[PDB]
């Protein structure tokens, strides 16, 4: 049926640069193409309908063009507030269909993370589990490595991590990694450390605490 193909999946631009988003239809959809913006924890918002009509209240830097099978959304001078996923859709014929989305991120100067560590709360330890959290705050670019060490033993398989979407106010990422042990295992060791590798750091940085301090 009508497949919509967006390209690229992701792109990275500096502030002030012109951004071009592409959407291709597998059949002629004439001008029945819309573009949507979606930010984290928000519903989609209409930007462009009828291929080229700017919707109410949308800034003039957003422009749509194209017809038949080739459609374009341009942002003439991209701003921090434009970090979002962008979706195209056709409403030419049933069933209406959408592309898979394009994620827009911004380039900025390298920024090293601040690294913080949190021992488990006493209330959690009463219940029989220990979560240890390492926080990497406000870094760029997104690539980072977190290595847990327990009494100098490199850990594998007992941690999970999550990264925020890029922040509109300063274009950085943050990352949280959680190391989970039983209370019984947690009580056996003294030193808990997370070691962070990032291109903004001359050498990997370690943050640690000692369970007996």
């Amino acid at each position: 049926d009508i497949q919509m193909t967006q390209s690229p999946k992701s792109m990275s631009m500096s502030v002030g640069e012109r951004v071009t988003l592409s959407c291709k239809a597998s059949e002629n959809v004439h001008t029945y193409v819309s573009w949507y913006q979606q930010k984290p924890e928000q519903s989609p918002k209409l930007l462009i309908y009828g291929a080229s009509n700017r919707y109410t209240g949308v800034p003039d830097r957003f422009t749509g063009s194209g017809s038949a099978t080739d459609f374009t959304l341009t942002i003439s001078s991209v701003q921090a507030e434009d970090l979002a996923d962008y979706h195209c859709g056709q409403t030419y014929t049933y069933p209406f269909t959408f592309g898979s989305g394009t994620k827009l991120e911004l380039k900025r100067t390298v920024a090293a993370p601040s690294v913080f560590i949190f021992p488990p709360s006493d209330e959690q330890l009463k219940s029989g589990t220990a979560s240890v959290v390492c926080l990497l705050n406000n870094f760029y670019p997104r690539e980072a490595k977190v290595q847990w060490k327990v009494d100098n033993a490199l850990q594998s398989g007992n941690s999970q991590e999550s990264v925020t979407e890029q922040d509109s106010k300063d274009s950085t990422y943050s990352l949280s990694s959680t190391l989970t042990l039983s209370k019984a295992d947690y009580e056996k060791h003294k030193v808990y450390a997370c070691e962070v590798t990032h291109q903004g750091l001359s050498s990997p940085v370690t943050k640690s605490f000692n369970r007996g301090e």
Binding site: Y36, S43, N53, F96, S114, E123, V133, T164, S176, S208
Partner: protein
């Protein structure tokens, strides 16, 4: 123009879901209302529409299990879907073109999870500020929201009065099958004993509401 949806929740595979969309600011006898869904980290999928005149059109891939109806006098539109599959897990939206050529107005979304697991409210633990969460004049503190199901949870700080510097991280699915997430905030390190910081957690599927004060430890 406004579209308000019923709340998120868990439903069992092979069974049926119901979502209500209550509209205001326009009349259902003049505008059609559509349903669209978005599987968690993916694109949008159109499900169907009930037009102002009351006829319906459905996505042919789903039409055997999909039903859309409405009550004009109550400004309500209903989505019903049965023989649910695990891959029906999605954020479900009501939307309308209004007077435009695309989906100009959207509901707030209803997160529906298809699973045989249990609904479970979270435990909330402090991430206590310390010397090891300080960098000069800036300190970080937070709260760990652990062992809940299904998504989502809402986290605010000081009931929403504190928004600057907050990072709420995407949840991870633990090996137990329950979700865990953290929320952190950075503040002046000199403020740690002088200001009250409370994380507020709302897990709507369970009606769990927890306020956790986050204080420095000794």
């Amino acid at each position: 123009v406004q579209l308000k949806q019923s709340g998120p929740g868990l439903v069992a595979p092979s069974q049926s879901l119901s979502i209500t969309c209550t509209v205001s600011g326009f009349s259902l006898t003049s505008f059609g209302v559509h349903w669209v869904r978005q599987p968690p980290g993916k694109g949008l999928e159109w499900l169907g529409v009930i037009w102002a005149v009351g006829s319906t059109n459905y996505n042919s891939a789903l039409m055997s299990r999909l039903s859309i109806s409405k009550d004009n006098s109550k400004s309500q539109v209903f989505l019903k879907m049965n023989s649910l599959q695990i891959d029906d897990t999605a954020m479900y939206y009501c939307a309308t073109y209004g007077n435009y050529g695309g989906f100009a107005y959207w509901g707030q979304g209803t997160l529906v999870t298809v699973s045989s697991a249990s609904t479970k409210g979270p435990s909330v633990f402090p991430l206590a500020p310390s010397s090891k969460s300080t960098s000069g004049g800036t300190a970080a503190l937070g709260c760990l929201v652990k062992d809940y199901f299904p998504e989502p949870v809402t986290v605010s700080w000081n009931s929403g009065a504190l928004t600057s510097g907050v990072h709420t991280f995407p949840a991870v699915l633990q090996s137990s099958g329950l979700y865990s997430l953290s929320s952190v905030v950075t503040v002046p390190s000199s403020s740690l004993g002088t200001q009250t910081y409370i994380c507020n957690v709302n897990h709507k599927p369970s009606n769990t509401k927890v306020d956790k004060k986050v204080e420095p430890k000794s």
